[PDB]
Design a binder for this molecule. Structure first.
Ligand SMILES: N[C@@H](CCS)C(=O)O
Length: 559
C-alpha cells in the first residue's frame, strides 16, 4: 500500500517500533509446527500473534514467511504450498495491522553458495524473485531479508526483489556471531560497504546475539552507511536450560538499550527470537516519539570478498596471473571449462602475498558465459580474496558483476564517454569500483596528454557522481616501444597528489625484453616512491616481491 518514498518519509520523521518473535511464540500457543505451515493449518494462531504485537504498540509487523521460499519449503515437503502459504500470511498480517505497516519477511534458504554448497547465484535469484512477486501482489509496505549469513545469497535476494519492484522499501540484514562475523566471514564494515551502494533502503542486524553484544557490531555498521538502520536483537544470547533453548533477557533489561541504539542512528527497533509481547509493550513506552538522529558515514575506497575487506590505505598487490594471454595451456583449459586450474593459480598467488586477484578470460566470444559466472562466484570463497574483474564485453561484465560475492574492482574503462557510462551503470546497479585507464582511442605519449585524460575523466565522473569509486591507471607502455616510463612516473606522482589511488599493469613495461623481472622491480620501486597505491603484477616473482617488501619497510609503511 505504501511505497519506499512514503516509508522513507515516515522514517525521517520518527523512529518506529517493529514486533517481537514468532517462531519462539507459536509453541506457547500449543503449535510446534513449522511456522509457515500455520498460515494454512491454523491461521487463527498466526493472527493472534500478530495482534499481540499490534496491541503492544508495534508500528510495523512482519509476515509469517521467514522460511517461505521454494528452496527452503522443499526441505519440508511444502514446496507446492508456496503460493497459499505466502498469500495467506500477507492477508493475515494485513488484517491484524489495520493501517500499521506490514513488511514481507524473507529469511535465507539454509543452502550455501557454490563451491561451499551447490547453488549458483542464478538459482538463489529466481528463488527469491518468486516469493517477492507474491508479496508485492498482496500489498506489503516493504520487504525485509532477515538473518542472512552469506553476502552472495543476500545480494541475490535484494537484486531479485528490486527487479520485481523498483518501488518497494527493501531492508537487508545479516546476523553476526560474537566475533562480529557472518557464517562466511563478513564483518559489519564489509556488509555496509558492499550493500550501502546497492539500491536498498535500509540495512540492519537481527538474531544470534542480545542487545548488549550487538551494540558494537551495530556501531560499526552505522559508521559505514547513510541508509536507514534497523535492529532486532534476540532477548539475550541463547542459553540451554532443562532441555532446550531459552532467551533470558527480561523486558526492562532489554529496553534499557533503546537509548544507545537511538544514539547510533537506529530507525526501526524491534526484537528477534525470545522477544515477547511483554518486551514490545515496554519498548513502546521507552521509545515514545523520537525523530531519528543524523549520521555522517566514513568514506572509504575498499573492495571485498565474503571474508576479506581490502582497504587501499597500504600498497595493494593485485595478482596478474589468471590471464590466458601467452598461456596456451590455461587458454585451452578455460575454453573447456576447467575450474581447478584457475583455482590453483588463485591460491598460489594469495599464498605469496596477493591481496586481490585480477581475472581475465581472453577472447571472450570464445568462452562460455556460464563459465565466467561460476569462476567469478567461486574464487572469492576458495582463495579468500576480492577480485579485479578484467572483462571487455559489456554483456559479460554485467553477468560477472551481478554474481560477484562482495564489492569488486572492475578492470577498466578507458576515458571514453560511452564506454565509461556503460561500465558505471553496471557498477551503480551491482556495486563495485572502477579502474580508469588514462588513454582514449590512442595511447598518450607524455605526462601532459595523460593529465588531460585525467581531467576529462574527472569531468565525466563528476557528471555521474562516481568520483569516489575509481582508481587511476596511468597506462604503462612497453620500454621496447618507446614507452617513456618517466612520463608514467610523473603521472603517478600527480594523481597521488590529488588524493586518488593509482594502479598499473606492471608487467606491460617489460613484456618484450630479457631480464623483465629487473625492469619490473625498478619501476615498482620508483612508482611506489611517487605514491603508487597498488599494481597488477606477478606475485610469484620472488625478487620483485622481496624488493617490494624492502621498499615498504624502508619507506616506513610496514616493518
Ligand atoms: N521473524 C522470524 C525470525 C527468525 S530468525 C521469527 O520471528 O521467527
Amino acid at each position: 500500500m505504501r511505497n519506499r518514498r512514503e516509508v522513507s518519509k515516515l522514517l525521517s520523521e520518527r523512529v518506529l517500533l517493529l514486533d517481537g518473535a514468532y517462531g519462539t511464540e507459536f509453541m506457547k500457543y500449543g503449535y510446534d509446527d513449522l511456522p509457515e505451515e500455520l498460515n494454512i493449518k491454523a491461521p487463527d494462531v498466526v493472527l493472534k500473534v500478530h495482534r499481540s504485537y499490534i496491541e503492544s504498540g508495534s508500528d510495523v509487523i512482519l509476515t509469517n514467511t521467514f522460511g517461505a521460499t521454494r528452496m527452503k519449503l522443499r526441505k519440508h515437503g511444502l514446496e507446492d504450498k508456496l503460493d497459499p502459504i505466502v498469500r495467506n500470511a500477507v492477508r493475515i498480517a494485513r488484517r491484524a495491522a489495520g493501517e500499521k505497516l506490514v513488511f514481507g519477511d524473507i529469511g535465507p534458504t539454509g543452502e550455501l553458495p557454490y563451491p561451499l554448497g551447490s547453488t549458483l547465484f542464478e538459482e538463489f535469484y529466481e528463488n527469491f524473485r518468486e516469493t517477492v512477486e507474491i508479496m508485492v501482489e498482496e500489498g506489503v509496505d516493504g520487504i525485509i531479508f532477515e538473518t542472512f549469513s552469506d553476502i552472495l545469497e543476500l545480494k541475490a535476494a535484494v537484486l531479485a526483489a528490486r527487479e520485481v519492484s523498483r518501488d518497494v522499501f527493501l531492508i537487508a540484514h545479516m546476523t553476526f556471531d560474537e566475533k562480529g562475523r557472518s557464517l562466511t566471514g563478513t564483518d559489519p564494515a564489509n556488509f555496509a560497504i558492499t550493500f550501502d551502494e546497492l539500491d536498498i533502503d535500509a540495512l540492519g542486524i537481527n538474531c544470534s546475539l542480545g542487545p548488549e553484544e550487538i551494540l558494537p557490531i551495530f556501531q560499526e555498521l552505522s559508521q559505514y552507511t547513510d541508509k536507514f538502520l534497523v535492529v532486532e536483537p534476540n532477548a539475550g544470547k541463547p542459553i540451554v536450560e532443562n532441555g532446550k533453548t531459552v532467551y533470558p533477557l527480561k523486558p526492562h533489561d532489554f529496553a534499557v538499550h533503546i537509548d544507545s541504539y537511538y544514539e547510533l542512528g537506529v530507525n526501526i527497533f524491534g526484537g528477534c527470537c525470545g522477544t515477547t509481547p511483554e518486551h514490545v509493550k515496554l519498548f513502546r513506552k521507552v521509545l515514545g516519539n523520537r525523530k531519528p538522529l543524523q549520521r555522517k558515514k566514513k568514506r572509504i575506497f575498499a573492495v571485498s570478498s565474503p571474508s576479506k575487506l581490502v582497504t587501499f590505505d597500504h600498497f595493494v598487490v593485485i595478482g596478474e596471473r589468471i590471464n590466458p594471454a601467452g598461456r596456451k595451456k590455461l587458454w585451452a583449459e578455460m575454453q573447456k571449462g576447467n575450474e581447478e586450474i584457475v583455482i590453483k593459480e588463485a591460491k598460489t598467488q594469495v599464498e605469496k602475498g596477493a591481496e586481490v586477484l585480477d581475472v581475465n578470460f581472453g577472447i571472450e566470444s570464445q568462452i562460455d558465459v556460464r563459465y565466467v559466472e561460476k569462476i567469478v562466484q567461486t574464487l572469492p570463497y576458495v582463495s579468500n580474496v576480492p577480485l579485479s574483474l578484467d572483462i571487455q564485453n559489456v554483456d559479460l561484465t554485467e553477468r560477472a558483476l551481478r554474481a560477484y560475492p562482495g564489492r569488486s574492482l572492475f578492470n577498466s574503462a578507458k576515458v571514453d564517454e560511452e564506454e565509461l557510462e556503460m561500465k558505471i551503470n553496471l557498477l551503480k546497479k551491482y556495486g563495485g569500483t572502477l579502474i580508469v585507464l588514462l588513454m582514449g582511442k590512442d595511447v598518450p605519449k607524455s605526462f601532459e596528454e595523460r593529465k588531460e585524460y585525467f581531467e576529462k575523466a574527472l569531468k565525466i565522473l563528476e557528471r555521474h557522481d562516481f568520483s569516489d569509486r575509481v582508481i587511476f591507471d596511468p597506462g604503462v607502455l612497453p620500454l621496447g616501444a618507446e614507452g617513456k616510463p618517466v612520463e608514467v612516473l610523473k603521472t603517478i606522482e600527480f594523481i597521488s597528489s590529488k588524493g586518488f589511488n593509482t594502479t598499473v599493469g606492471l608487467s606491460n613495461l617489460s613484456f618484450g625484453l630479457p631480464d623483465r623481472s629487473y625492469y619490473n622491480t625498478a619501476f615498482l620501486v620508483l612508482g611506489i616512491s611517487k605514491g603508487l597505491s597498488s599494481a597488477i603484477m606477478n606475485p610469484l616473482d620472488e625478487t620483485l616481491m622481496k624488493t617490494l617488501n624492502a621498499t615498504l619497510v624502508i619507506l616506513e609503511k610496514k616493518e
